[PDB]
Design a protein around this ligand. Sequence first.
Ligand SMILES: *[C@@H]1O[C@H](CO)[C@@H](O)[C@H](O)[C@H]1NC(C)=O
Ligand SMILES: [Cl-]
Length: 345
Amino acid sequence: LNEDLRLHLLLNTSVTCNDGSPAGYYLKESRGSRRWLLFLEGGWYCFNRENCDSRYDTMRRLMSSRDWPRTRTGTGILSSQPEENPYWWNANMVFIPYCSSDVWSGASSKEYAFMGALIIQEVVRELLGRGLSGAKVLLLAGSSAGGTGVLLNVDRVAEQLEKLGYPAIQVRGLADSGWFLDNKQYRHTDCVDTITCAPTEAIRRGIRYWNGVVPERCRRQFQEGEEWNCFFGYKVYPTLRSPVFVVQWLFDEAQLTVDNVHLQEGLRLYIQNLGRELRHTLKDVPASFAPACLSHEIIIRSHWTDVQVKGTSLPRALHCWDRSLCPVHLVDSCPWPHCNPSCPT
Ligand SMILES: *[C@@H]1O[C@H](CO)[C@@H](O)[C@H](O)[C@H]1NC(C)=O
Ligand SMILES: [Cl-]
């Protein structure tokens, strides 16, 4: 097929996936478009040697490029089909697979390797030779751990480009399902399994184990040793220099899982309070889209055009935002999961 994204493994083979195989990116160039969409894949993380070994058996794709296919079809925001992607089908499309298990924060060279931030850096620089140097807009986008990666890296990439001599390129971000709360769990549990570890504790261990770096402007706000705060969207958002659009299910499953909810009286309240706290953190975020659904991820799913908030679709909210650089602070007020009719299933 004419329209598939093609795999490029990183020429510098010292920047690697967890297991030492080369990292990489898929690319579909678009004749004539000055819009670049760079997508960071998600899929959790591992914060100790034992959890990582276990992920290596269960989910090897997420720790190695050995079996990556040479092509991939872009879906959602990365689709070249006008019906699937009405404003940006004609964009330069890039998919960066997530094989560092580090929320894209790993920045050192030397057991498992965690080099997420360096993979992004490396992909940006290779792309300059394939046409990124003439871009008007570089949209750094991501889902789940990729979404959080956007927040950790978008200003780093803005700096990388001005340092390399390409200041005219407008760097922006789009974080989907990467906006989490460092809250108290519903029912307590000791941190042992990835999926049920409290978010706060998970990042504390992750950041040390990974040698993870956080954006500089957020790092300065918190004490030495408390860099884990910068993994949380409401804490990193305020000092961002690059513009960022935030897409977040008010009742995100990954959030519920880490809050040790499993799917009552007390639970209803906790859940409904979650939704409320979420809304509160989006109050000063005009570029947001936050439907009251219980779900996780949206932007590279084929059905992303379906969801609406206040009569506006996600592709339309994004296009208006792009144009402002038609409403934009699109947060559902209805208070219980699925109260929005447009939710998916
Ligand atoms: C290649 O990547 C390695 C590991 O990050 C880095 O140390 C080395 O300097 C890179 N090569 C360059 C920038 O030429
Ligand atoms: Cl061309």
